[PDB]
Structure formats: C-alpha cells, structure tokens
Amino acid sequence: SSCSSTALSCSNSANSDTCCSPEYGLVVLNMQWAPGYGPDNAFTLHGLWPDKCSGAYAPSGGCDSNRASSSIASVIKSKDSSLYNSMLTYWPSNQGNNNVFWSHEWSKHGTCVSTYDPDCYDNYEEGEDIVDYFQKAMDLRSQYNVYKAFSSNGITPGGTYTATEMQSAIESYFGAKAKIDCSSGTLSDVALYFYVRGRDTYVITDALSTGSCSGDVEYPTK
C-alpha cells in the first residue's frame, strides 16, 4: 500500500523503486509558439523529455524498444477519444503529420518514464502507459500557462519585447528561469525544467540554460 510521496528525484531521498520515482529524474516540458498551430492564446506542446539528473539526455533511441511504436494516433484514438481531440488542439505537429510526431515523442521519450512501465500497473491493459504519458504532458502544458505568465506582465502576441522582460515574466510568475529560444529573433519555444516528487508531482526548478533569445524578440500573432 503506497508510492512514497516526499521522495524527490535527483536528491538523497529518491526511492529505488523506479515505479515510484522516475529513473530519468530531471524532466523538461518543451512548448512552442508555432503561428498557424493551436489556439491564439496558447503555446502548444512539443514534448515532455526525461533527462539524467546532470541534464545529460537519455538514450537517443528511447529506452524500450519493445514498446516503441509508429501507430500512436490509432492507439490513442481507440483508448481515448477525448485525449485524441485535445491533442489535435494542443499538440499539433507543425509539419502536418501528427502520427509521425506523436510516435517519435512516445518512442524516444515516453518509453524513458519508468513510472509508466507496464510492470508498475497492478492490472495492466495494453495502451495504459501511452495514455498516462500523453495525458500527463497535456495537463502540465495546461497547468503551466506561459501565455498567461506573459500577458499578466503585459506581453501579448503581435509586439516586440525584450528577452530580458520575457525572462522576468516567466521568472516572477513561476518562480524559475526557463529556456526561451528564438529563431531569427522571433520567439519559437519555451521550456520549463522539473523534478518529480513521489510518482508524478512535478516541482519546477531553474532551466539549465536561458536559451537563444537575446535582445528584441518578436512575439507574432498565431
């Protein structure tokens, strides 16, 4: 009875049961501002990537080949219609091929979250782990609203802002530095770094890099 909840990944208190404390203890939530994809008032998801505590990446081919998949859109569609519909809105592939995008994120990163290993479920049915993972990430993109962090500090779409004011809004709103990346001086992605308390309560921590945005950054309308 229990999954030891004060356990914090990357600390002297992580319990060795990889079903109750993630093996890749440092996780980054990568969200992007792609014009033409998702709501006007929201960053959409790129992925939830588990990393080593030193920030080193996990195996580039994922961590469970037997669990890799190139059919993630029909697996989610059949296990959960609502989760499939939310993903079309909040996790669109900015390259017009959702199934290849979601299959890559599941295979390379999803297999590396040990709390969703099938041996952790006391009564497992196929596809349980996949839905837990896509749902945990969607929830985090919702709960960590970067668009609200910027607007509340007067940074809205369709303006030129300084990278410096952008970091203060993320820093003051969430209490941690994020990795803000630009492409040709236009904002493109924002990533938030985390630690896990117990099985899956994310605790934010400072990004291990402030990112490529520097100077005046354009924040376009979607």
What is the chain's length? Answer: 222
Resolution of the solved structure (Å): 2.0
Q: Give catalytic residues, as residue numbers.
A: 46, 105, 109
CB-CB contact of 177 with 170 (8 Å): yes
Report the CATH superfamily, name and number, of domain 1-222.
Ribonuclease T2-like (3.90.730.10)
By DSSP bridging, strand 186-197 and strand 201-205 are: antiparallel
φ and ψ at 41, to 5 degrees? Answer: -100, 30
Q: How far apart are CA 155 and CA 43, in angstroms?
A: 14
Q: CA nearest 180: which of 168, 169, 189, 193?
A: 189
Domain boundaries, the chain: 1-222
- Technique behind the model: X-ray
CA 60 to chain CA mean position, Å: 17
CB-CB contact of 115 with 109 (8 Å): no
